[PDB]
Design a protein around this nucleic acid. Structure first.
Lengths: 161, 160
DNA sequence: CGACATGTCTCTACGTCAAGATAACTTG
DNA sequence: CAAGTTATCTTGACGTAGAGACATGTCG
């Protein structure tokens, strides 16, 4: 029995008026996200000098195509964090020399965050190591099992939408 | 296309030398965990005056049975957080009157964190709402799909 | 226009990790 | 005993939400 299953057995004993079965799937979802980030993905980003959120900004800039420049709002909408938290991520990356701010010509309120050449070289390198890492994380599942997990998670996400 | 699928399409265009397929399942895993906690689970805990980690401690104490008393170590092992972070959680709950610290008779180094009557009443109500909340969250999946999701996540966790 | 909305940062306040401290426990 | 380990808290550092501030964009 894993953590989620054992916790459900305790609740079945302590509150027989309750059906706590839902705790298994959602507990394992939470635990999987935490463990995979903490033990597998984040140490790799750290070897490149990046926090996970910093890797995410560089990846979002890079995959958006030349000239690898996005507004803070596009970045925080993509990252699903607050505007102020995105300011902090940009500040860290800017000080490290991986991105550069400039005025957005399209909007007087705006800023464009752009990859530097050094930032682009870093993420171009890290993304390959990252995907290799992700594949190893998933290797306990067959190809078909990974596809079905992706489908089940999409159905669950569409449910929230 | 959802967020993960669109991100993968961008990578396929920008780095055709790369196979970014793994990003779909792991991106959706991360997004699902965040969105469900942010939009569904954590607001409910807040209605009871609890942070998610505080709910978790009270739940761990309650489900362990009378006298609902566990050591900080048993708690932080169950929560998968560090010892110092568990101190903070206990501090918040104790100040709020939901738990009480006492010396552990079994270990001179140790403490027992125990539910108060008010803390037990709080978690006994909140856990019912929480389970109702979880079931609605999962209602987009059939019973068989939820079982399959649970099995696939267990296989993935054992892999780690 | 003035009223309202948005982009973005600054700021407070909090949960978190890891390192360190130290009393007490374990081991041999 | 003497050395090593564990329980637990304290502490510095950092990411985070979201309120607030303010310049600039949008609306009738």
């Amino acid at each position: 029995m894993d953590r989620a299953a054992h916790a459900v057995e305790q609740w079945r004993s302590e509150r027989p008026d309750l059906d706590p079965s839902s705790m298994i799937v959602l507990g394992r979802l939470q635990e999987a996200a935490l463990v995979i980030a903490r033990d597998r993905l984040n140490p790799l980003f750290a070897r490149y000098g990046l926090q996970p959120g910093e890797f995410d900004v560089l990846a979002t800039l890079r995959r958006s195509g030349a000239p690898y420049a996005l507004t803070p709002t596009a970045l925080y909408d993509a990252a699903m964090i607050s505007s102020g938290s995105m300011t902090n991520r940009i500040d860290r990356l800017e000080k490290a020399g991986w991105v550069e701010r400039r005025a957005n010509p399209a909007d007087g309120r705006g800023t464009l965050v752009a990859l530097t050449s050094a930032g682009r070289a870093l993420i171009d390198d890290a993304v390959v190591a990252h995907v290799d890492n992700q594949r190893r994380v998933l290797s306990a599942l067959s190809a078909a099992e990974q596809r079905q997990l992706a489908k089940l998670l999409d159905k669950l996400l569409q449910g929230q939408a």
